């Protein structure tokens, strides 16, 4: 083991300003605990449990302490089949949380995000319902914190797995989570890489005649 390590960095410059973005898929909501005293439990019993939620995550560190993590709540309901639909207003979930983690060598790293999610409801349009539907215009907001690990495979394409619970526990004085604390899911991300480019035909010979 004999390598120069003074001020000649080749892997990364002397700056802790990195940026990585990706997306995870899994379950956002689900009923498991709690019950009801109503005779009508299961009104319908289909044969397709199509429940998949998409989520875009983005992290960026500004100082050698922690980095900001922005999430995006997308997809979650199964319904896309009709002659004519409505598209007046578009809905999209936006999450704001702080992510803190660290690598193990140079490919395996662990991180945890603590914050909240803020999404909007779909405005009223040409919809058709006779029981369950959203006829209100409120803003969805709820605090949450998840934790998982990440693995780097490609030069600009890594994969990460997020969970609701963490193997260890850092610092915490109080926890207020009725529905849940975190969410388990699988996703893939990539580092912020961009090489320079300048019109310079050095190798490629252009001048044919002169």
Swiss-Prot record:
GO terms under cellular component: cell outer membrane; pore complex
Segments traversing the membrane: 18-27, 53-62, 66-74, 93-103, 108-117, 143-152, 157-165, 183-191
Subunit and interaction comment: Monomer and homodimer.
Species this chain originates from: Klebsiella pneumoniae
Topology Extracellular: residue spans: 28-52, 75-92, 118-142, 166-182
Any GO MF annotation of the entry: porin activity
Gene Ontology terms describing biological process: monoatomic ion transmembrane transport; symbiont-mediated suppression of host toll-like receptor signaling pathway
Residues covered by region (4 X 2 AA tandem repeats of A-P): 202-209
Ranges: Sequence repeats: 202-203, 204-205, 206-207, 208-209
Family the UniProt entry places it in: Belongs to the outer membrane OOP (TC 1.B.6) superfamily. OmpA family.
Protein localization: Cell outer membrane
Transport among keywords: yes
Described function: With TolR probably plays a role in maintaining the position of the peptidoglycan cell wall in the periplasm. Acts as a porin with low permeability that allows slow penetration of small solutes; an internal gate slows down solute passage. Required for conjugation with F-type plasmids; probably serves as the mating receptor on recipient cells.
Name used for this protein in its record: Outer membrane protein A
Site (Part of salt bridge gating mechanism): 69, 160
The entry's keywords: Cell outer membrane, Conjugation, Disulfide bond, Ion transport, Membrane, Porin, Repeat, Signal, Transmembrane, Transmembrane beta strand, Transport
Free-text domain note: The extracellular loops are most variable in sequence, and in some bacteria confer sensitivity to phage and/or colicins.
Membrane-topology descriptor: Multi-pass membrane protein
Residue intervals annotated with topology Periplasmic: 4-17, 63-65, 104-107, 153-156
């Amino acid at each position: 083991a004999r390598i120069m390590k003074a001020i000649f960095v080749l892997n990364a410059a002397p700056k802790d300003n990195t940026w990585y973005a990706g997306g995870k898929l899994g379950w956002s909501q689900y009923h498991d605990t709690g019950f009801y005293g109503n005779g009508f439990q299961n009104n319908n019993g289909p044969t397709r449990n199509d429940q998949l939620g998409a989520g875009a995550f983005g992290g960026y560190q500004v100082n050698p302490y922690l980095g900001f993590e922005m999430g995006y709540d997308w997809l979650g309901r199964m319904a896309y089949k009709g002659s004519v639909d409505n598209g007046a207003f578009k809905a999209q979930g936006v999450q704001l949380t702080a992510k803190l983690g660290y690598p193990i060598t140079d490919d395996l790293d662990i991180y945890t995000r603590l914050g909240g999610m803020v999404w909007r409801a779909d405005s009223k349009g040409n919809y058709a319902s006779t029981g369950v539907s959203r006829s209100e215009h409120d803003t969805g907001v709820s605090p949450v914190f998840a934790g998982g690990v990440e693995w780097a495979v490609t030069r600009d394409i890594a994969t990460r797995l997020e969970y609701q619970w963490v193997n260890n526990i850092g610092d915490a004085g109080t926890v207020g989570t009725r529905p849940d604390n975190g969410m388990l899911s699988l996703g893939v991300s990539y580092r912020f890489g961009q090489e320079d480019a300048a019109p310079v035909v050095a190798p490629a010979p252009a001048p044919a005649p002169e």
